[PDB]
Motif scaffolding. Structure first.
Motif, mmCIF file in Angstrom:
data_model
loop_
_atom_site.group_PDB
_atom_site.id
_atom_site.type_symbol
_atom_site.label_atom_id
_atom_site.label_comp_id
_atom_site.label_asym_id
_atom_site.label_seq_id
_atom_site.Cartn_x
_atom_site.Cartn_y
_atom_site.Cartn_z
ATOM 1 N N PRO A 80 9.166 -71.196 -19.643
ATOM 2 C CA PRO A 80 9.225 -71.182 -21.112
ATOM 3 C C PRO A 80 9.327 -69.788 -21.706
ATOM 4 O O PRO A 80 9.887 -69.640 -22.798
ATOM 5 N N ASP A 81 8.814 -68.762 -21.029
ATOM 6 C CA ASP A 81 8.791 -67.413 -21.588
ATOM 7 C C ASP A 81 9.231 -66.385 -20.552
ATOM 8 O O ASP A 81 8.743 -65.251 -20.531
ATOM 9 N N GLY A 82 10.169 -66.761 -19.687
ATOM 10 C CA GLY A 82 10.730 -65.809 -18.747
ATOM 11 C C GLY A 82 10.662 -66.225 -17.293
ATOM 12 O O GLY A 82 9.924 -67.146 -16.930
ATOM 13 N N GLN A 83 11.431 -65.541 -16.449
ATOM 14 C CA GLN A 83 11.506 -65.832 -15.019
ATOM 15 C C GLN A 83 10.916 -64.646 -14.265
ATOM 16 O O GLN A 83 11.600 -63.647 -14.026
ATOM 17 N N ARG A 104 -4.310 -65.742 -18.800
ATOM 18 C CA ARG A 104 -5.144 -64.890 -19.633
ATOM 19 C C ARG A 104 -4.363 -63.789 -20.341
ATOM 20 O O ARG A 104 -4.963 -63.012 -21.091
ATOM 21 N N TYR A 105 -3.052 -63.708 -20.137
ATOM 22 C CA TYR A 105 -2.248 -62.606 -20.650
ATOM 23 C C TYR A 105 -1.185 -63.123 -21.610
ATOM 24 O O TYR A 105 -0.717 -64.258 -21.477
ATOM 25 N N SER A 106 -0.806 -62.279 -22.574
ATOM 26 C CA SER A 106 0.050 -62.708 -23.673
ATOM 27 C C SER A 106 1.535 -62.516 -23.397
ATOM 28 O O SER A 106 2.335 -63.372 -23.788
ATOM 29 N N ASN A 107 1.930 -61.418 -22.755
ATOM 30 C CA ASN A 107 3.346 -61.191 -22.494
ATOM 31 C C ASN A 107 3.879 -62.133 -21.420
ATOM 32 O O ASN A 107 5.001 -62.635 -21.532
ATOM 33 N N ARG A 108 3.088 -62.383 -20.380
ATOM 34 C CA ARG A 108 3.421 -63.342 -19.329
ATOM 35 C C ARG A 108 2.439 -64.502 -19.460
ATOM 36 O O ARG A 108 1.285 -64.409 -19.041
ATOM 37 N N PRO B 242 2.229 -67.240 -31.167
ATOM 38 C CA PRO B 242 1.741 -65.881 -31.429
ATOM 39 C C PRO B 242 0.404 -65.622 -30.752
ATOM 40 O O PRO B 242 -0.612 -65.425 -31.426
ATOM 41 N N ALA B 243 0.392 -65.626 -29.423
ATOM 42 C CA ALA B 243 -0.823 -65.415 -28.653
ATOM 43 C C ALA B 243 -1.223 -63.947 -28.679
ATOM 44 O O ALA B 243 -0.373 -63.052 -28.681
ATOM 45 N N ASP B 244 -2.532 -63.706 -28.709
ATOM 46 C CA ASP B 244 -3.090 -62.355 -28.690
ATOM 47 C C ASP B 244 -4.033 -62.251 -27.496
ATOM 48 O O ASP B 244 -5.149 -62.778 -27.528
ATOM 49 N N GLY B 245 -3.580 -61.574 -26.445
ATOM 50 C CA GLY B 245 -4.379 -61.371 -25.263
ATOM 51 C C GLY B 245 -4.013 -60.083 -24.556
ATOM 52 O O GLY B 245 -3.042 -59.408 -24.911
#
Lengths: 131, 299, 133
Positions: A80-83, A104-108, B242-245
């Motif tokens: 959904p947000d990258g490979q 626990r992380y927002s970018n991945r 809009p997740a914040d982590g």
């Protein structure tokens, strides 16, 4: 020589293909867990070590349909947000991808570190709660 | 002399002769347009796209013509014909030492056995030219801007506007037509590189590969155009959350992989809004579509 | 314990998924061999034994991209005349299915038998001759 486990746990039953994994999950009503990883990625290697050397994760993994892939799946909903790797995604036996079960992380959104084993256990227990 | 000419093929099939050193507009040629569920074709490399959203076929138009009649995993049948033309052009007057320009015309007719009368057509014309430090020729995607920077250093020499976009730069070398390499850039990207750095240094600032979708008098056409951070990409179908982590960098980028035409699973997103199906066919730059997982079966 | 080869050959390099096998065959320009088989079928077991014990096939298989499956894939192109087992189908690195390469039975165009060692080896050699483009 060439094993399905690829080092993620040998006393566990692993599925070869995504389609047979979906068939097993639908028939046996077991949630499907998919681990995306690469053999040339040190992050994947460390997560592999922690995953294989964790008693509770191995004990809980028998309640799932397991599948680890070194190549990207044909399903669009699984990234959904990258490979990227390592990346653990869950599928309900209803053939519905559980993209709401995140790390626990927002970018991945679905990346796990070799310290989020309690988080991985919590996410697996959440995935066992069927929709 | 022919050696001093730089023939430029545009979308509408015109052949604009230019001086290599100066770029002044010499005679121009008038010919048929380069290219004519739905199918969108890249008029530069002949690639085909499936209009699930939008995807890319693993076979270009000449491959489909050579493999015709054939069928894919989806069930769509493909027919193909090829036809050449060999008009002779005077290098000075540009009328139809002499110039030997050969054009191959490819046509692929697609019919599905599911829908009995509904069908699609496409055309793709390729000039008969073999593919021959810094990139010398740059072409804008939306407009017909053509840039020529020095391969030795990377400083612009001459810019020219031709109207419709440029889909091929050819030269007359040995005693035939030869295709020079070129890169497709967004006009904003070229302007930004000109004003900020002053010297174009494209290898032969972050440049991102996008799939520009353009519309002209012959239908929709795609093109692979580079952009810089600042070019407004059309929004994708999904805005996740809009997740914040905490941010993690301990991941490794992995290849895209092929994608299936019809989905096999549903999906549930965490409190996140889903929008329209990616809204393709919008004039602008999109993210690179995924290549479709399929094979061929010659009938 | 459980292996990717499933007893067809342990010194050979096998692929796990159909899509990864296709990607590998595309990048490396090697023909792709797909073996459809079931653990229950006695014919599948006999052909597995013969295939594993064949040194000529084992040496030649290293030039291929290998894939053995126990569950049928979604691709209909790999079932041109049915979903019987065992089947051995060859894919050209141009992503074209080599339906010309057949066994010895008209009804089952891709089903081999333990007595068809030489025919299968010749079919593999023919698959090594890649199609034109």
């Amino acid at each position: 020589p060439q094993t399905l486990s690829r080092g993620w746990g040998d006393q566990l039953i692993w599925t070869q293909t995504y389609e047979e994994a979906l068939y097993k999950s639908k028939t046996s009503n077991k949630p499907l867990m998919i681990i995306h990883h690469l053999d040339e990625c040190p992050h994947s290697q460390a997560l592999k070590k922690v995953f294989a050397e964790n008693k509770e994760i191995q004990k809980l993994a028998e309640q799932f349909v397991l599948l680890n892939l070194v190549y990207e799946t044909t399903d669009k909903h699984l990234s959904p947000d990258g490979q990227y790797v390592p990346r653990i995604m869950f599928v309900d036996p209803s053939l519905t991808v559980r993209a709401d079960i995140t790390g626990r992380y927002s970018n991945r959104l679905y990346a796990y570190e070799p310290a989020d084993t309690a988080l991985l256990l919590d996410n697996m227990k959440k995935a066992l709660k069927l929709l | 002399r022919p050696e001093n000419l730089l023939l430029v093929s545009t979308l509408d099939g015109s052949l604009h002769a230019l001086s290599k050193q100066t770029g002044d507009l010499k005679w121009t040629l008038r010919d048929d347009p380069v290219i004519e569920m739905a199918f969108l074709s890249d008029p530069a490399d002949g690639s085909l796209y499936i209009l699930q959203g939008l995807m890319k076929l693993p076979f270009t138009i000449p491959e489909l013509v050579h493999a015709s009649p054939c069928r894919s995993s989806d069930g769509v049948f493909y027919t193909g014909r090829k036809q050449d033309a060999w008009f002779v052009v005077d290098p000075e007057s540009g009328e139809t030492p002499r110039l030997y320009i050969g054009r191959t015309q490819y046509t692929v007719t697609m019919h599905d056995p599911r829908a009995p009368a509904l069908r699609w057509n496409t055309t793709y014309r390729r000039y008969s030219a073999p593919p021959m430090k810094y990139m010398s020729h740059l072409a804008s995607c939306g407009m017909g801007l053509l840039l020529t920077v020095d391969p030795g250093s990377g400083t612009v020499l001459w810019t020219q506007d031709l109207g419709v976009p440029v889909m091929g730069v050819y030269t007359w070398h040995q005693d035939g037509l030869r295709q020079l390499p070129h890169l497709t850039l967004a006009r904003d990207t070229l302007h930004f590189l000109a004003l900020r750095w002053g010297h174009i240094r494209l290898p032969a600032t972050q440049l991102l590969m996008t799939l520009y979708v353009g519309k002209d008098e012959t239908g929709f056409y795609v093109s692979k155009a580079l952009v810089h951070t600042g070019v407004a990409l059309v929004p994708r179908g999904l805005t996740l959350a809009p997740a914040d982590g905490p941010t993690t960098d301990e991941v490794t980028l992995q290849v895209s992989g092929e994608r299936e035409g019809s989905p096999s699973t549903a999906v549930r997103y965490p409190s996140g809004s889903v929008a329209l199906p990616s809204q393709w066919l919008l004039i602008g730059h999109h993210e690179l579509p995924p290549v479709l997982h399929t094979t061929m079966l010659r009938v």
